[PDB]
Amino acid sequence: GFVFTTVKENPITSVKNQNRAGTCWCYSSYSFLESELLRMGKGEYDLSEMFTVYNTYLDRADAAVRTHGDVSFSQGGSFYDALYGMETFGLVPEEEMRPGMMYADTLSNHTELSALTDAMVAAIAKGKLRKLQSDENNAMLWKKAVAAVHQIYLGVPPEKFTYKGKEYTPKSFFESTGLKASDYVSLTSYTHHPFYTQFPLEIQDNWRHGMSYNLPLDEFMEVFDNAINTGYTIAWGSDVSESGFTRDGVAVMPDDGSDMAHWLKKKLNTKPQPQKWCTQAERQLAYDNYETTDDHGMQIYGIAKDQEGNEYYMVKNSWGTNSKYNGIWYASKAFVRYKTMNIVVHKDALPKAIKAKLGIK
Amino acid sequence: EGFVFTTVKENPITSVKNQNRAGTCWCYSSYSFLESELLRMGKGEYDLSEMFTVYNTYLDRADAAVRTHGDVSFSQGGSFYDALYGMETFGLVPEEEMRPGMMYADTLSNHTELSALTDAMVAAIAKGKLRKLQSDENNAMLWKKAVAAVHQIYLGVPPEKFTYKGKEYTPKSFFESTGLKASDYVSLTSYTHHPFYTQFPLEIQDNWRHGMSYNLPLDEFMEVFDNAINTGYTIAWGSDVSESGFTRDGVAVMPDDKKLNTKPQPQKWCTQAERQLAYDNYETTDDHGMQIYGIAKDQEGNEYYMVKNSWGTNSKYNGIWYASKAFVRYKTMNIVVHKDALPKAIKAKLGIK
Amino acid sequence: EGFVFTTVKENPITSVKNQNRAGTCWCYSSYSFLESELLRMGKGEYDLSEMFTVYNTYLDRADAAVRTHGDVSFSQGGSFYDALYGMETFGLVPEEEMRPGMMYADTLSNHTELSALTDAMVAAIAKGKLRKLQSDENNAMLWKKAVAAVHQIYLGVPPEKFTYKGKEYTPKSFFESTGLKASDYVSLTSYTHHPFYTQFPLEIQDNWRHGMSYNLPLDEFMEVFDNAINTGYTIAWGSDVSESGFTRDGVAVMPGSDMAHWLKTKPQPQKWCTQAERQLAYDNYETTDDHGMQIYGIAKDQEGNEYYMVKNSWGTNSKYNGIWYASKAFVRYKTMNIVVHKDALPKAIKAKLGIK
Amino acid sequence: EGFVFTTVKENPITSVKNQNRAGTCWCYSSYSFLESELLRMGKGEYDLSEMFTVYNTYLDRADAAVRTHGDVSFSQGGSFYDALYGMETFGLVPEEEMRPGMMYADTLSNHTELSALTDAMVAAIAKGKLRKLQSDENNAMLWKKAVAAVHQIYLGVPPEKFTYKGKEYTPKSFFESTGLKASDYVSLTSYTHHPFYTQFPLEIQDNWRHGMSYNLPLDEFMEVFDNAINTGYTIAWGSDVSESGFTRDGVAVMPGSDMAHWLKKLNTKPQPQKWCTQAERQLAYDNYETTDDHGMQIYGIAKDQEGNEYYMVKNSWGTNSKYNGIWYASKAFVRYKTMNIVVHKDALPKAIKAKLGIK
Amino acid sequence: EGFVFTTVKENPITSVKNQNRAGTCWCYSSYSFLESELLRMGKGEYDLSEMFTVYNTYLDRADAAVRTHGDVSFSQGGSFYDALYGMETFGLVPEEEMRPGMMYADTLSNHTELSALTDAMVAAIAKGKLRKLQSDENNAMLWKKAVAAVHQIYLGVPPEKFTYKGKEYTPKSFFESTGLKASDYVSLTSYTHHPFYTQFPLEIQDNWRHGMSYNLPLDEFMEVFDNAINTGYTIAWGSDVSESGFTRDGVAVMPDDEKVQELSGSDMAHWLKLKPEEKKLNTKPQPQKWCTQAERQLAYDNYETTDDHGMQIYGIAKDQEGNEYYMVKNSWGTNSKYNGIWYASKAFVRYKTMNIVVHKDALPKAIKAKLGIK
Ligand SMILES: [Cl-]
Ligand SMILES: [Cl-]
Ligand SMILES: [Cl-]
Ligand SMILES: [Cl-]
Ligand SMILES: [Cl-]
Ligand SMILES: [Cl-]
Ligand SMILES: [Cl-]
Ligand SMILES: [Cl-]
Ligand SMILES: [Cl-]
Ligand SMILES: [K+]
Ligand SMILES: [K+]
Ligand SMILES: [K+]
Ligand SMILES: [K+]
Ligand SMILES: [K+]
Ligand SMILES: [K+]
Ligand SMILES: [K+]
Ligand SMILES: [K+]
Ligand SMILES: [Zn+2]
Ligand SMILES: [Zn+2]
Ligand SMILES: [Zn+2]
Ligand SMILES: [Zn+2]
Ligand SMILES: [Zn+2]
Structure with missing residues (x-):
């Protein structure tokens, strides 16, 4: 199975x-x-x-x-x-x-x-x-x-x-x-608007039309690590409707109208596997084509490693404590890169160079 | 060439609402x-x-x-x-x-x-x-x-x-x-799909409490209206008013088929069976509630009940309607009167002490 | 380790339909x-x-x-x-x-x-x-x-x-x-949204004739069941049977998530309901679908718990050949109405209802 | 006994479409x-x-x-x-x-x-x-x-x-x-469900891009109309025109029964206008009386024979109408029924520009 | 105890699509x-x-x-x-x-x-x-x-x-x-709501062009199938496949439920309670229900025979008990027991076929003459 070791975690309150x-x-x-x-x-x-x-x-x-x-x-x-x-x-x-x-x-x-x-x-x-x-x-x-x-x-x-x-x-x-x-600040990473500008994510629950700053995918991921490593946590909005997101507390991204089905009727998510690391274009396709849609909100508060050295973010969920890790999930960096819709962090969690590119004083 | 009404008898009412x-x-x-x-x-x-x-x-x-x-x-x-x-x-x-x-x-x-x-x-x-x-x-x-x-x-x-x-x-x-x-x-009605002189709940949407009405043959039913008014009582009158005969100009008539609804005409006097058919076939349906408080005559001697409506006073007779006896006989769905408004013999047939 | 039933008393019935x-x-x-x-x-x-x-x-x-x-x-x-x-x-x-x-x-x-x-x-x-x-x-x-x-x-x-x-x-x-x-x-029921010892028509879709039921407090209501069976009568029994406790194996006993959206037989002590608990289930849609059966007897399981014996109308291809056993606790909670002959009523209950 | 209009000032427009x-x-x-x-x-x-x-x-x-x-x-x-x-x-x-x-x-x-x-x-x-x-x-x-x-x-x-x-x-x-x-x-509007002198996106179906408007108190909002026209500018004018006061004859002026179930010269000559308050204007937006934003161009100011003031409106329904595709909207109508306007920044009076922070 | 098939005759086909x-x-x-x-x-x-x-x-x-x-x-x-x-x-x-x-x-x-x-x-x-x-x-x-x-x-x-x-x-x-x-x-069918030996358009949604079929009595209809295969022709076969007998494991059978029970060890009571996996109705050779013209008609009239899937019959095979089957090229690819091929019992085909198309020369001479096909 999975055995996780915390690399770094920041203080959180009890699981609700x-x-x-x-x-x-x-x-x-x-x-x-x-x-x-x-x-x-x-x-x-x-x-x-x-x-x-x-x-x-x-x-x-x-x-x-x-x-x-x-x-x-x-x-x-x-x-x-x-x-x-x-x-x-x-x-x-x-x-x-x-x-x-x-x-x-x-x-x-x-x-x-x-x-x-x-x-x-x-x-x-x-x-x-x-x-x-x-x-x-x-x-x-x-x-x-x-x-x-x-x-x-x-x-x-x-x-x-x-x-x-x-x-x-x-x-x-x-x-x-x-x-x-x-x-x-709210941050996202998509190509249907220019990078380093602000726009309101086009999703039903953003009916207030709140703005997000748009970053290229690699700089976007740089923010996650910098936040955790300098003592901040992250409000994390993600699609969790994937076979990779499980009831057993792990979210992974493993690299793998029928006429017939009408007339009649691997260990991918249960141990460490090599991850699919998406490109900006692959990430975009999933947002455009309805594969990445349903924004569920959670908190990322730490970074952990499995026994093979693969990296995960540590996630506080709000489904109570009756689960393998008492209401906590581990999401692989590959999963987070592909399925994140938006995050919110304190401005001081941003690396200095990224802050400057966004024009955040 | 219109209607001229003369009150034969009327009982006290409050203001038109x-x-x-x-x-x-x-x-x-x-x-x-x-x-x-x-x-x-x-x-x-x-x-x-x-x-x-x-x-x-x-x-x-x-x-x-x-x-x-x-x-x-x-x-x-x-x-x-x-x-x-x-x-x-x-x-x-x-x-x-x-x-x-x-x-x-x-x-x-x-x-x-x-x-x-x-x-x-x-x-x-x-x-x-x-x-x-x-x-x-x-x-x-x-x-x-x-x-x-x-x-x-x-x-x-x-x-x-x-x-x-x-x-x-x-x-x-x-x-x-x-x-x-x-x-x-007591609530009274007149239909033949239940026996006369018994009680049943009228099968209409607004009678969802399933309140009972006493059932009378049509002629005895009409006898109650007259006895009520003539002995000083008024009547809560539930009627279908969706008829070309019921007008905005304050008269409800049942003419025998132009000037059909605008001057006095000979009335169609329905049988029990004709009244029943209209209830069975959806021609008599939408029970609008009003108050009958008097009796009047037109210039040819045709008889009308005087009706207090609840559409305010901006109308020909200041919120009052005249409904011909023929109309009332055909289109009434139910009435409520005080028990003492009933003639003694009808009271006895219904078993009302 | 299942149920073993012993008949205490049963009255004559015709064949299972x-x-x-x-x-x-x-x-x-x-x-x-x-x-x-x-x-x-x-x-x-x-x-x-x-x-x-x-x-x-x-x-x-x-x-x-x-x-x-x-x-x-x-x-x-x-x-x-x-x-x-x-x-x-x-x-x-x-x-x-x-x-x-x-x-x-x-x-x-x-x-x-x-x-x-x-x-x-x-x-x-x-x-x-x-x-x-x-x-x-x-x-x-x-x-x-x-x-x-x-x-x-x-x-x-x-x-x-x-x-x-x-x-x-x-x-x-x-x-x-x-x-x-x-x-x-006479039809009998037991609810508190109308006064006891009066008649009213149960407010359910299949009572479109608006037939009346006499209303009894719950304990007197259950007294009628036992008196009927013990004096040789049977009971037309209208009950909700949409409960995990009502089974295909012939016994009826007392029983919008964000997370669920994203993912996927022996004698027991019975809950004996109060009048208020019974009422809540009728008011809140937990007790709704009135299915009709016939209670014709009383039986006991091996632990001495009491059951009514029920003739069902689903044919004879079942554990007890079309017969069910319903615990007294089930009947008390899930019964909607019953019909019995007037003479099946205990004298004192008859008098309280004004039934000559 | 009808309307006779005299142009006070009008700015150049192209042909009626x-x-x-x-x-x-x-x-x-x-x-x-x-x-x-x-x-x-x-x-x-x-x-x-x-x-x-x-x-x-x-x-x-x-x-x-x-x-x-x-x-x-x-x-x-x-x-x-x-x-x-x-x-x-x-x-x-x-x-x-x-x-x-x-x-x-x-x-x-x-x-x-x-x-x-x-x-x-x-x-x-x-x-x-x-x-x-x-x-x-x-x-x-x-x-x-x-x-x-x-x-x-x-x-x-x-x-x-x-x-x-x-x-x-x-x-x-x-x-x-x-x-x-x-x-x-810039786009401008005047409502009280957001603070004055801030920007917000009007909550209407056709503003699905969520474009921003600057919010002005009603009197300053109307000041912008007059200043625009008087200094040579025109106005893109978004208004509700579903009112008995808005007519087919080229003028826009200020205007479940049980019984109905069973059974004045207001808009044709000059009349005294109802001059709405900010609150009355707001109520109509909140309650669905002011809803359907139709777009037109205001390009001038005119007077009727009694001296009442009107804005001159270029419509887009062709020229088969009393004033060849032009409408006259009373200042009272415009004040009550306008949803938003767009003008060039230089059409704004200096003091209003400053209050909005527009350099 | 499964099926083992032997080809009696088959005609050339292209690859399974x-x-x-x-x-x-x-x-x-x-x-x-x-x-x-x-x-x-x-x-x-x-x-x-x-x-x-x-x-x-x-x-x-x-x-x-x-x-x-x-x-x-x-x-x-x-x-x-x-x-x-x-x-x-x-x-x-x-x-x-x-x-x-x-x-x-x-x-x-x-x-x-x-x-x-x-x-x-x-x-x-x-x-x-x-x-x-x-x-x-x-x-x-x-x-x-x-x-x-x-x-x-x-x-x-x-x-x-x-x-x-x-x-x-x-x-x-x-x-x-x-x-x-x-x-x-020519398109052929077999139904009694129109006279035999005449043409009519089958009353189904996908025949919106109102194409005609020639109508044959059931036994002569089946004769065409055999004559086609035995003289080197194949058959475009339109059939209902919404039956428990049509399986994902490559057979279409029409077992007689009543007869299969009386040959089993189970009594009639002991059977109805047995699990489908142990009835063995569709998994080995069983005695077939052979429909009459009237039974076939009822199933068309009553919606039991409705949804035309199209396939190709290209041969005849036998199981180990000597029962006869038509060999069917399906279009669901090759990931199945017989690599995209199905075996349909003659009883199934007789009951469930809606229409076929064959070359005119596939028809036996006497049937051709009864239909007026020169
Ligand atoms: Cl595209
Ligand atoms: Cl969600
Ligand atoms: Cl009404
Ligand atoms: Cl039967
Ligand atoms: Cl309540
Ligand atoms: Cl049942
Ligand atoms: Cl044009
Ligand atoms: Cl327009
Ligand atoms: Cl054959
Ligand atoms: K809390
Ligand atoms: K998804
Ligand atoms: K009042
Ligand atoms: K009517
Ligand atoms: K029977
Ligand atoms: K143009
Ligand atoms: K092809
Ligand atoms: K079928
Ligand atoms: Zn959620
Ligand atoms: Zn009414
Ligand atoms: Zn039932
Ligand atoms: Zn428009
Ligand atoms: Zn198909």
Whole structure:
């Protein structure tokens, strides 16, 4: 099988469990931000995903309505949603808004919430209403409806709360962290836009049209290593719908309409194998042709080696701890190179030369 | 060459209301009827809140849709029984405690958006693929909380307590102060697909509570209308009004086939079988609720019932219609009257003590 | 290490039948029940025609769908009350006068094609755009003739007269000869969304006739089961059987992931539910699909746990030849309604319900 | 008793064009605007090919629909930014090199059949069940070739080279010869759901490129219109025209029943106008009353006989109308119904330029 | 206990081809048949381009869909007559001039994306709301140009001229050089909803050209198969293969379930409960159900015999018990037990055949005369 040795790892908080909701964008964002707070000497935090999921879905519903249904309304999101969110809505501690509380559970199950809110948003955004109703202050009634339903399933966001003896609002709690959205950059590597420029990734969950800086593939990978080696972690958005991404905690990239199938019915991923190291063009083809699509968010926090000396990034996942390495995955460098869609890191995690090529002061 | 009407007899009614852009005529007509009853019973003039009863009725209708996995349709209509069940179960509140339009800066109902949202929500539960609906620690259902909250956003918050003419009430104690009783009222109809002098629930979408009606032969059925008006009672009248004979100019006629609907004409007087065919074949379907409160004659001596409608007062007779007896005989689906409005012999045949 | 059952008491039943490929258990179980009643009442052994009653019930169901413009769903199921209403309204006929499968060269039902046609026909009237349905000179509706004629092609022609054991009957006079009366039977349930000791119609799709059930608290409800069996009666038993605890091996016992998206027999102690737990399952869709069977006895396993003995209508190719054992705990949690003869009720419960 | 208009000031425009049966007003208006810019800049009179730019824009729009699995809608509309992005990316060609209607023996556009085919194709890729789209040996996508080929069949073959007034050009070199620059132009709007004096992308279906607009308070926004016209500039004007006040007779002025189920001279002469607040304008955008962004060119200011003020509007519906394809829009209408405008940076008043940080 | 086959007689065939991910068996089997005909006629070995004919046929099928406002379904299938009509109307080209997969960097067909696009396009014209389709100045229809262009993008550009073995041809002149004639070939079937010895068009979706078949009583129909093989001809064979008897392991059998039980050790109860793997219905020689004309008719009327897959019968074989089978060249490549060849029992062929095409001279003289074929 695989035997892994840590080469370097940076501090992370405990492994969380998103359970039955597509909220990995927020869990991974918060694993990342909690590592940042540890790195910045602020200590250990447990931030409320539900608070930010709640506020983000209200904005996503608004985007769906303003675009008459073009912006899809669904459970996913982006790292930028979390960075925009902290600056706009604030932050609250986990205990002020926990998953599952409204329906007598301790973990999320958002299937019913989505059934209701998807139908409501569609009825406004894609229906035949010619003039939406508003109150005497021009506040929209449909927005009040969608907010009220989200509160019934997710909880009431607090206006004030007490944390470790001090009273905060979500805004003042955020301010106390010292985090700034402007400290963080999103990076990607594709050829349908020029290198060293910014563009918004064309994926459904980037409905805020947040920008990413575009780097050639080798410089892109240089950022991963520099980040980990200088003490930073990485918010990692990747496609994980590959036979190489397994339930047994490893993600590898090994080098390997039928008429007939209609009328009738190797050890590739289980031990170290030589990896396919993709070119920029191969990586591009997979993004263009739908092979690399479904952006699942995780945190890379370290580098490890297998017994044959192959290199892997160490990944904190948000599926709880019931797995081979207690909620941790190992992703080969070859996998990460081919299947990564975007990353977010602190600006100071970037090598000086790359920073200069991107024009980041 | 038009209609000239002379009142033969009419009983007291309250002011003409306007349901505007909602299918809530079942509640407006029920309350016109109950307000006439209160006047008749010496309790004075009331203006009851339709919105309070519409709100509570819709929450029960949604529950019925969900329990039947979508068989019970979820829509804006309802029945006289919804109002009678409602007053006994939820109570009553004065108009001013829950007015139409308030939530969206109007004074009249427009429920198109509320229906767009609540129809979609109810369908997502009742007709979707959810295998286990979510509940809180007290086994209260989350979807019900959602549907209630959305109805409150568009219709208003129903009051738990309020003050009316110097006294504090709950909706229950306000209802109790009126002296109204559901058991005083009977629903009557006339069809041949069930035996006469028995009770059955009319097979129409808005009777999802499966309320019962007593079945009478057509001539005895019409005898009840006249006896009611002539002895001082009014009638909650449920009728099909989708006929060329029912007009915007305030008359509902049943002429024998131009000037068919614009002056007095000889009327087609239907048989029981003709009335039945129209119910069986979809020609008599869409039960709109109104109040009959009097009898009138045209200049040729043809007889009409005087009808209080709920479309406001911007019409030829200020919100009042005249429906010919022939029309009423053919197109009525059901009526509600106080038990004492029934002639003694008919009461006895129905077994109503 | 399996189950070994010992009969404590059982009452007489007729042979196990097979509904095969149709959702007609409501009628098979009703008739297993009524045939047990006839044995109990000294009338001897009958084999009544399910198909005759299924035929007539579907024509009424279509009418209900059309009158309500599609609110009443049109499908294969039904209720105990459909059978009891049926016998009084349409009559009864012996099995041999209208057998399953005959029209398509089989001996067991397969109603898939019949349903494909009749569902489509009923929907075209009930949910379509026709503004005036057609009728003949006697005001008889043409669409009803069409739906009747199609049902006859697949189910058979109901007899107007027939001979049985040397005498001529109509379906009505055959029913009259049985001595059965619908008024002898009561439907019972146990739920808290209506008051106890009152009647209401269970809010399920197959109760489109809106037949009433008397509502009892859960413990009194279970008292009725035992009293019935112990005094010689059987029970028409409507239950949810879509549970991991209900098995193909003849025993019924008490039992949107991001991660799941990306990847892929002996006596046990029973959970004894409360009224509130039972209610939650009915309210939340966990207890929904009312399948009809007949409880005719009480049995024990080797550890002394108690079970009701159940006659099913899936034929005899199963571990106990078409018989099931349902634990008392299962029955308590998953029962939707039962029908028993009034005299099967304990006297005190009869009085609380106002049943003379 | 009707309207009589007197021009106060108007700036040079080219002839009135006719988009006919296609939702391509975004391109016709952009080009009316750019042709006025060329006149203003001393480059003379041009007639630029809308079809060339419509063609290239639709291929990019199909790509956006496919990359977003159908979120970006695929339809005939677009934005001013589509034209500005387009000239810099694809180039420009003269009208005669790609005319409307030519492929189907007409001289005006009718794109109903083209849209029927291409909408169906794009949806089969973007919203279907294909798990892996096909590509050739150079990683070029087959579906893109298909959509390009079908657009050529209906719109024409875009030229690689052509001759215009004695000189050979490519679309890129023709664009370069005009001296136009996308960076000379800014998009402006006025809404309160984002802060004033910042940039954001208007949340409308035809802004699928997510082009940015600078946000101004309503009074400063209107100041820009007047300053532009009065200093010799024209305006690319994006507005909702689905109002009883917008008429077929060339003037734009400020304007579930149970019962309906069973059963004034407002726009024809000068009237007092409702002058909207920022909040009223916002409500209409939020509530769907102001939605369908149609593109036109404002090129002047006029007065009616009572002294009320109007902007003069070059439309793209041909010349068979009261004022030969020109409309008059009251200042009150423009204030309430405008969604966005594009002007040259030098059309902006100095103080507004400074507040926006535009050097 | 499996099958062991001995060839009794087989006629020359070309190599086994692979249609891969497209429903183009009608063309592959037609061309296996026509290539056998060319060998029989002394013209040597050819490898004809299926893709050329698939391309042209689909353009005609789209036209038929549009003219009938969607009644003619637009899909990947077709008929033997499509190939015979095609060679006379469009011509023929060698494989190398238009190969499967080339446009998308493969060597085998995958037409899923092509169909997803072209189905949607044809439906937008045939079943949409367009009241007047657009045309150019020569009255050529724009939608046809669109569908042709898209098919070329996925299938390739059909050649106007090409060189083959030192000579220049057009598709027409290449067809002429083969000596093949559509009029040499007849389609035969056996059904009772039309009179015997008459012609009618089989009522199936892929016969949208309404090509005719001659109708024979079942026993005379089967006589044709044997006479064809025994006198040196092969057969284009259209059959239903959606049966438990048609297997991935290269046999198509029609076992009598009732008889197989009574020969086993199991009683009727002990059997029905046994696992399919131990019944042995399709894995060794078993007594066959031999259908009557009426049973064969019922299966066509009731949807049990419906989906025409096309293959080539080129020989007759026996199993170790002396039961008879037709030898079948399939178009699913060579990765199978008998390298792409199937053995179909005579009982299977009798019950499940929908139609065949053979050269007229393959028909026994007396049958030829009863059909009026000079
Ligand atoms: Cl994901
Ligand atoms: Cl509840
Ligand atoms: Cl109505
Ligand atoms: Cl049976
Ligand atoms: Cl069952
Ligand atoms: Cl033009
Ligand atoms: Cl490409
Ligand atoms: Cl326009
Ligand atoms: Cl033979
Ligand atoms: K947390
Ligand atoms: K993938
Ligand atoms: K009122
Ligand atoms: K009517
Ligand atoms: K029976
Ligand atoms: K032009
Ligand atoms: K070939
Ligand atoms: K078959
Ligand atoms: Zn995820
Ligand atoms: Zn009404
Ligand atoms: Zn069942
Ligand atoms: Zn326009
Ligand atoms: Zn095939």
